[PDB]
Design a protein around this ligand. Sequence first.
Ligand SMILES: Nc1nc2c([nH]c(=O)n2[C@H]2C[C@H](O)[C@@H](COP(=O)(O)OP(=O)(O)OP(=O)(O)O)O2)c(=O)[nH]1
Length: 154
Amino acid sequence: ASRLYTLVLVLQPQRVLLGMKKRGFGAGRWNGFGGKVQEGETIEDGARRELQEESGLTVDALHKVGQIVFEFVGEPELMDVHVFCTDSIQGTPVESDEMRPCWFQLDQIPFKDMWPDDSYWFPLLLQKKKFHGYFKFQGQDTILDYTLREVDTV
Ligand SMILES: Nc1nc2c([nH]c(=O)n2[C@H]2C[C@H](O)[C@@H](COP(=O)(O)OP(=O)(O)OP(=O)(O)O)O2)c(=O)[nH]1
């Protein structure tokens, strides 16, 4: 029993765009842009749509980089997050009521103000690796157990 989500990272050779989420799940943490996939749309179409909705950017080619499943103990639905990366965007990032975007240098990623799993897989994304991950959380701050592996095909 899992629900599909997307997460898009705008990753350029020396910087990455993250957005500080202002409301909903994960508010108060920096993250990529994404959300729930809708009925009748492909995962990739959902990722492109969520990127525009949350950041104001237009992406053409999106590259699959990872799949991470999240389990929150006591919550029945698993979150099946499909992670994508793009180095080619149009438009300038837009700050809205839902999100505050900011560019970060690759050696200045704000891990202390991100979901804790990001410290595990974000360095794989930075080195252009692809991965499958599973993280079991107790609440929103504690990782109880996890698995993470590099793959050739997402
Ligand atoms: N980096 C990172 N991203 C995560 C984690 N957990 C998690 O759900 N996400 C991402 C996946 C999605 O992009 C987003 C959660 O989706 P969302 O609840 O905001 O979706 P939504 O905007 O479509 O829903 P709604 O509130 O508008 O109805 O956060 C995590 O541990 N790390």
